[PDB]
Structure 1
Amino acid sequence: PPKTPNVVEPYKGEVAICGLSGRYPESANVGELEYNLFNKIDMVTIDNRRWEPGYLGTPERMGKVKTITDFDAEFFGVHTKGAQTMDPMLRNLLEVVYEAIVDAGESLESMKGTRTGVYIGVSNNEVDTAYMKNWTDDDAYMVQGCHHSMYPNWISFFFDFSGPSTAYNTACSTSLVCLDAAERHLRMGVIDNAIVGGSNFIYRPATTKLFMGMNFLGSSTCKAFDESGDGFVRGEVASAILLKKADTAKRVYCTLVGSMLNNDGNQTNGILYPNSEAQEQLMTDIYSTHKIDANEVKYFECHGTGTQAGDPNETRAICNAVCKGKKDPLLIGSIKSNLGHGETASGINGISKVIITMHSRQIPPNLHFKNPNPKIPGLFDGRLKVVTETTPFDGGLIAINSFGMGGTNAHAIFRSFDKRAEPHPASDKPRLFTYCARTEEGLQKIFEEAHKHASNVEFHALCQESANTKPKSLPYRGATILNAEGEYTEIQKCPSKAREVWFVYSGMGSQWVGMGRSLMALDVFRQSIEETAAILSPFGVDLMSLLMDGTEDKLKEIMPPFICINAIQLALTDLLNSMGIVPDGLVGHSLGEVGCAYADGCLTRREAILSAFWRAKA
């Protein structure tokens, strides 16, 4: 009955961002986002996905995700009534969180019960008015599916996390505020992981009209660092990331050097006015507290809203704080000229671009930067240089800013993880790639991607870390052979109930020339045969000779058949045991009982092989 207290001790190690996933405008996943960014593809389009291009006079162009009507309600254990009375943002976020968890090499079983905190940042609550205009009974379930406090909690409930689950609303700089909280809680020792994230979808055109009345929005797409910039364009994001202690991370995109937050105070230019001094002080504090040489920053993910009052002040603060002492131009950029302004998901957007720049090791181009802003002297003095084309970022520190409306600024620094791949003994021999999914088409696509990376073993390991999920979560189980002479692929729907794995051992008559000759390719099989041949050598039996160059006449005798069959059975048992297959039951025919004893732990390799040798000798 007594409960053992948790060891809440301060943590001094490194924090690594391990996973990333999310929906971005004109991008169903991170891969599409990366492709669009690196091909100078504009992700702000004009259509009637949300409303007509000009409805109520709102700007025609907007950043909209592909779809928000899709959700795998059964997977997350949510009934039809709850899913219907549920915010699409939270649905997409739950899917994105699961994708990010899988991306980091984690799984449902591994992350279940861990001390993980969820720090979703969401501010949009427009689905409450639409669902309440014609409220009827059975809509009460919105409280558990529509409340903003239910975004992280559901993640905690589904994944069984037992850490601080809180929702944050800081406006355009909420994602980095959640990152700050995650760093705070991780370093105190309450949690070992974090699910920092945030989603933002546009539903009400009147909200766009409300933003227009304040001069927030411009005419065209965000003209970051452009002299013609006059505003921003609204965007949609549902991204999320996973943070873990660097020592226990199976995949490390980068390391979180540190993040902090500050406020502007009573400025005479209005509450909705950026404070250059506040941002500069925040930058100075962050680069001084961690003793980070500001001249070491290679790329700077700026909060390029594109306004005439935001870009000049942000650039001035960056020039005063990070460009002091730099002997080369500092490459600045933003992810707002590509997909617009994500509002409460701008910081997650910057995190996504940074994790993409540091993964592909190339800085995505910046769009619509034609003429430098005359009010930004850094662009003419050589201190600043907008990355208008793909730049080969080799390694170092990348800084992100998130200046929320109202004056709540945020800064964060990430250090690149330089562990370039080295060849594995595998990646040139056949391998068995096994995985599970929710649909046959999804598993087929997974196998296609695995074949695309048949030469990568680390990718196989990451896939395998989450390839053992129970059939309940991922009923479609499949397997394919990478680097195979003949194509193989199997996909079947496995019921929730788990079937029994019984080992059946054959006896005499399984002999033939070349038995087990091909299986020598596997290291374990050859090792087992060698370790059995060494045992049987002193008794006048050269197992290797009988198994490799043995002929039919040799196998006609009594000894070689018994020896070879037992050797194959024991080697296959070793292969199965190494692969991690535990038999619930063992049965065997005559001459296979020794193998059953060996696989059951009742006998040893020496005992089993000598038992067969004694049998045939007698």
Structure 2
Amino acid sequence: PPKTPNVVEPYKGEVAICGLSGRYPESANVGELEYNLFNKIDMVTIDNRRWEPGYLGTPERMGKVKTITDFDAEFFGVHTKGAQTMDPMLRNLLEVVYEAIVDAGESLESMKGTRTGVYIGVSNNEVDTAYMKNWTDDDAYMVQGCHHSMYPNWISFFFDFSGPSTAYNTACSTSLVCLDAAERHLRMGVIDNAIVGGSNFIYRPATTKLFMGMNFLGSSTCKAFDESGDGFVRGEVASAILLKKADTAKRVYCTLVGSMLNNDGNQTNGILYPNSEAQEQLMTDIYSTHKIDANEVKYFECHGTGTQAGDPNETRAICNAVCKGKKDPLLIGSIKSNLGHGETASGINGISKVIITMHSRQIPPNLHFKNPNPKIPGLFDGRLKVVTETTPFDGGLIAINSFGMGGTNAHAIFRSFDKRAEPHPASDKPRLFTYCARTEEGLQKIFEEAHKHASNVEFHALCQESANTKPKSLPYRGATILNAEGEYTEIQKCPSKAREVWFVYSGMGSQWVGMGRSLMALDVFRQSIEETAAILSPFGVDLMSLLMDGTEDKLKEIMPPFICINAIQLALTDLLNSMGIVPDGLVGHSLGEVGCAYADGCLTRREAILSAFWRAKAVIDCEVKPGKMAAVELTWEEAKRLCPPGVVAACHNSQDSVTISGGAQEMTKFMAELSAQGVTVKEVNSNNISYHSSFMTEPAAYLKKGLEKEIVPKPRSKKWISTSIPEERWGNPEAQTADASYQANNLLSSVLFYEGLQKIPSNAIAIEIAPAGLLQSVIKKSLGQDCTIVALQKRKSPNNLEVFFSALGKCYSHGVPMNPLGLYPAVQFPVSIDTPMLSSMVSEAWDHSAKWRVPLVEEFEY
């Protein structure tokens, strides 16, 4: 009952921005914003998305996002009634927050329960008036859907964050204020992560008219640093970022050196007038507290609203505080001239640009800068230089100013992260890319993007870090192969309920020339085979030669089949374990029980391979009489009654398959007699030996004598289902350890494969681990229709690695977690700064079939 106090201690490490996502004017994702910025494309347009271009005399051009009517409600657990009475800003913010979380290499399960704080910045409350004009019952939910305090809380509620959730309104400087609050809470020890963000959507034209009444808005776009500047143009943003401790971040766009806030105070020019002195003091304080040399700043994202009275003061402060002592012009810019003014969200906009400038290593151009402002001496003195075209920002510090209406200035500094990517052993060999999404089209787009970056392993690691989300959240599970000779792609909708995984190990009959030869490409497979060969070498067996240069004649012998089959099974088990597949159940045929024991942990590699070798040695050394085994088409009881003398039913494979075996003469006459009555008695070439019959009475004991001194008794887990000891005898001691007695019993007693398969559920994923899918038909007939059956290898296939990857992709698509990157050396985190952005794919991979209510112009008039 007592609760352990949380350790709240100061943090002295670095704070890194890991994820970024958002909706920007004429941009549905960060990638579109980057493309528009780097192509000198104006994101402010003239249309009637919100209202007619000129309604009530408002300015025609505006910065508007593509759509504000879509929201994946069922993903966030919001019923239709709540979603309808939900601000579009909050819905877009939730989607953007999830996209940013995914971008930083995190996932729903990883971010749940963490000490993360939300610091949303929102001020637009026009939705209240729109929805309250004709208020009726069932609109009560608005309290939890429209209130500005619920914007962060909802984010904390869905992601299960347990940190300070707050909504800020400082106007224009609000986003950097939220960043400062997040930094303050991070450095005191309250939280380890922050979800700093902000939103701003335009709904009310009368708000634009009221803004124009104060001369805030101009005629043309935001001509920042231009002599013709006379105002700004309203814009829309729904962006958010994720902050973390640099020692635990999996991706670091940059590092937050420090942020600071202040107020201009009292001035004789009015409350709505920037104070250059206060801004200069703020910048001096921030640059002196952190000992940052102001001459090292390479780029400066200014608060270039384009106003005549605003730009000169910002420029004067910059020159007096930052350009003092600089030996080269300081590159200044502002994103307002590109996508307009974001209002309360403006602070986030610049941050986004900074991340872009700190990810692509290029400074986006500034638009509408034709003639320098004569009131700006710096532009003529060489101290300042507006970036009118792409510039190669190599590295350093970037400073952002977000001065706000009313007089609350804010400054922040970011340090670049220089970890340029280096080659990986992978990125030139086939790889398995597994992911999940909400829609089939989104998953296909994600796979296309992954193929576009098939040569990047850091991107694959970032995708995999969030590729194990439960089917309940992301139902469309898919798998593909990058750098594949043959195109492969599987996508399927997986039910919320989780199915059971049942490893199935095959016995004899799966041998062939070239087994596992392709799989030698994988390092883990080759290492496992080499270890097995080294273990078996002291016994005069060269596994490497048999597996690589072995021929059909060699495989005809008794030992090489057992040795190679066991080695391949062990290698496949090692591969699966390295990937991280946990078998909920284990079953095996004859000679497959050793593999089941090895996988279950009751046996070891050396003990398993020695058990197989001892089985082969006992079979060969003993002069077991000319024997015969045959797969009759009789039922278990019917075969147990037709069995003549010197003939006993060995393997109950399927409900219509028996492996009746005995002496060669007795087996021959019984075969002809069964074919006389008429049944499909095919001969199973068992190296002319009758296993699991009375003829095994001598070898089995020998095997025991061979294995009594090697196999250390160990308990058998409930996962492993014995196929040699009847259920009625499971409770007895003999069925508790896989010692030499167990091996002798399974080599002697009949194989109850059907009985073991009966224990499998009706919708379990059974993975057939063997050199070839020998038991595919038997397992399919046994389990049923609702059970998925896969084979990790195909007989005489031209490329078994592709078959292995395809089977594993199918298994993942059916809803079994795995780590495809476990077959290669782990990627060192944080990843290189060259890794692409994962936010876009999630942004365009949403389920947006339904359309929700949006405020209408007619609701603002009355």
**Alignment TM-score > 0.5, same fold:** yes
Q: Cα offset for 1:149?
A: 0.1
Q: Cα offset for 1:606?
A: 0.2
Q: Cα offset for 1:46?
A: 0.3
Tell me, in whole angstroms, the C-alpha distance in 1 between the residues paired with 2:210 and 2:498. 56
Tell me, in whole angstroms, the C-alpha distance in 2 between the residues paired with 1:288 and 1:502. 63
Q: Cα offset for 1:529?
A: 0.2
- 1:401-452 deviation digits (Å, cap 9, x = unpaired): 0011010000000000000000000000000000000000000000000000
Q: Cα offset for 1:55?
A: 0.3
Tell me, in whole angstroms, the C-alpha distance in 1 between the residues paired with 2:325 and 2:583. 66
- 1:157-184 deviation digits (Å, cap 9, x = unpaired): 0000000000000001100000000000
- 1:76-107 deviation digits (Å, cap 9, x = unpaired): 00000000000000000000000000000000
Tell me, in whole angstroms, the C-alpha distance in 1 between the residues paired with 2:517 and 2:552. 15
Tell me, in whole angstroms, the C-alpha distance in 1 between the residues paired with 2:510 and 2:304. 72
Tell me, in whole angstroms, the C-alpha distance in 2 between the residues paired with 1:501 and 1:351. 46
- 1:182-239 deviation digits (Å, cap 9, x = unpaired): 0000000000000000000000000000000000000000000000000000000000
1:58 corresponds to? 58
Tell me, in whole angstroms, the C-alpha distance in 2 between the residues paired with 1:590 and 1:426. 37
- 1:31-88 deviation digits (Å, cap 9, x = unpaired): 0000000000000000000000000000000000000000000000000000000000
1:394 corresponds to? 394
Tell me, in whole angstroms, the C-alpha distance in 1 between the residues paired with 2:161 and 2:53. 42
- 1:216-266 deviation digits (Å, cap 9, x = unpaired): 000000000000000000000000000000000000000000000000000
What secondary structure, in the 3-state scheme, does the structure 2 residue paired with 1:140 have? coil
What secondary structure, in the 3-state scheme, does the structure 2 residue paired with 1:466 have? coil
Q: Cα offset for 1:524?
A: 0.2
What secondary structure, in the 3-state scheme, does the structure 2 residue paired with 1:171 have? coil
Indicate whether 1:228 and 2:236 are aligned: no
Q: Cα offset for 1:297?
A: 0.1
Tell me, in whole angstroms, the C-alpha distance in 2 between the residues paired with 1:568 and 1:33. 51
Q: Cα offset for 1:531?
A: 0.5
Q: Cα offset for 1:337?
A: 0.3
Q: Cα offset for 1:112?
A: 0.1
Which one has a bigger Cα radius of gyration?
2
Tell me, in whole angstroms, the C-alpha distance in 1 between the residues paired with 2:111 and 2:431. 27
Q: Cα offset for 1:132?
A: 0.2
Tell me, in whole angstroms, the C-alpha distance in 1 between the residues paired with 2:267 and 2:236. 31
2:40 corresponds to? 40
Tell me, in whole angstroms, the C-alpha distance in 1 between the residues paired with 2:501 and 2:460. 24
- 1:357-381 deviation digits (Å, cap 9, x = unpaired): 0000000000000000000000000
Q: Cα offset for 1:453?
A: 0.1
What secondary structure, in the 3-state scheme, does the structure 1 residue paired with 2:479 have? strand
What secondary structure, in the 3-state scheme, does the structure 2 residue paired with 1:166 have? strand
- 1:253-280 deviation digits (Å, cap 9, x = unpaired): 0000000000000010000000000000
Tell me, in whole angstroms, the C-alpha distance in 1 between the residues paired with 2:515 and 2:377. 77
- 1:294-331 deviation digits (Å, cap 9, x = unpaired): 00000000000000000000000000000000000000
Q: Cα offset for 1:475?
A: 0.2
Q: Cα offset for 1:465?
A: 0.2
What secondary structure, in the 3-state scheme, does the structure 1 residue paired with 2:474 have? coil
Q: Cα offset for 1:523?
A: 0.2
What secondary structure, in the 3-state scheme, does the structure 1 residue paired with 2:247 have? helix
1:472 corresponds to? 472
Tell me, in whole angstroms, the C-alpha distance in 2 between the residues paired with 1:332 and 1:125. 33
- 1:114-159 deviation digits (Å, cap 9, x = unpaired): 0000000000000000100000000000000100000000000000
What secondary structure, in the 3-state scheme, does the structure 2 residue paired with 1:248 have? coil
TM-score normalized by the length of structure 2: 0.71
Tell me, in whole angstroms, the C-alpha distance in 2 between the residues paired with 1:430 and 1:218. 56
Q: Cα offset for 1:486?
A: 0.1
Tell me, in whole angstroms, the C-alpha distance in 2 between the residues paired with 1:325 and 1:98. 44
2:626 corresponds to? none
Indicate whether 1:535 and 2:529 are aligned: no
Q: Cα offset for 1:587?
A: 0.2
Tell me, in whole angstroms, the C-alpha distance in 2 between the residues paired with 1:525 and 1:312. 67
Which consecutive residues of structure 1, in runs of 5 or more, have no partner in the other structure? none
Q: Cα offset for 1:582?
A: 0.2
Q: Cα offset for 1:550?
A: 0.1
What secondary structure, in the 3-state scheme, does the structure 1 residue paired with 2:344 have? helix
Tell me, in whole angstroms, the C-alpha distance in 1 between the residues paired with 2:167 and 2:575. 49
Tell me, in whole angstroms, the C-alpha distance in 1 between the residues paired with 2:350 and 2:5. 38
Q: Cα offset for 1:355?
A: 0.2
Q: Cα offset for 1:471?
A: 0.2
Tell me, in whole angstroms, the C-alpha distance in 2 between the residues paired with 1:98 and 1:64. 22
Q: Cα offset for 1:520?
A: 0.3
Tell me, in whole angstroms, the C-alpha distance in 1 between the residues paired with 2:521 and 2:201. 53
1:428 corresponds to? 428
2:449 corresponds to? 449
1:509 corresponds to? 509
2:340 corresponds to? 340
Tell me, in whole angstroms, the C-alpha distance in 2 between the residues paired with 1:275 and 1:342. 21
Q: Cα offset for 1:539?
A: 0.2
What secondary structure, in the 3-state scheme, does the structure 2 residue paired with 1:529 have? helix
What secondary structure, in the 3-state scheme, does the structure 2 residue paired with 1:172 have? coil
What secondary structure, in the 3-state scheme, does the structure 2 residue paired with 1:325 have? coil
- 1:339-390 deviation digits (Å, cap 9, x = unpaired): 0000001110000000000000000000000000000000000000000000
Tell me, in whole angstroms, the C-alpha distance in 2 between the residues paired with 1:357 and 1:556. 66
- 1:6-28 deviation digits (Å, cap 9, x = unpaired): 00000000000000000000000
Q: Cα offset for 1:286?
A: 0.3
What secondary structure, in the 3-state scheme, does the structure 1 residue paired with 2:358 have? helix
The sequence identity of aligned pairs, in percent, is: 100
Tell me, in whole angstroms, the C-alpha distance in 2 between the residues paired with 1:501 and 1:65. 45
- Report runs of 4+ in structure 1 exceeding 3 Å deviation: none
How many residues align? The count is: 615
Indicate whether 1:611 and 2:611 are aligned: yes
- 1:437-478 deviation digits (Å, cap 9, x = unpaired): 000000000000000000000000000000000000000000
Tell me, in whole angstroms, the C-alpha distance in 2 between the residues paired with 1:490 and 1:277. 62
Tell me, in whole angstroms, the C-alpha distance in 1 between the residues paired with 2:521 and 2:200. 52
Q: Cα offset for 1:487?
A: 0.2
- 1:507-542 deviation digits (Å, cap 9, x = unpaired): 001000000000000000000000100000000100
2:21 corresponds to? 21
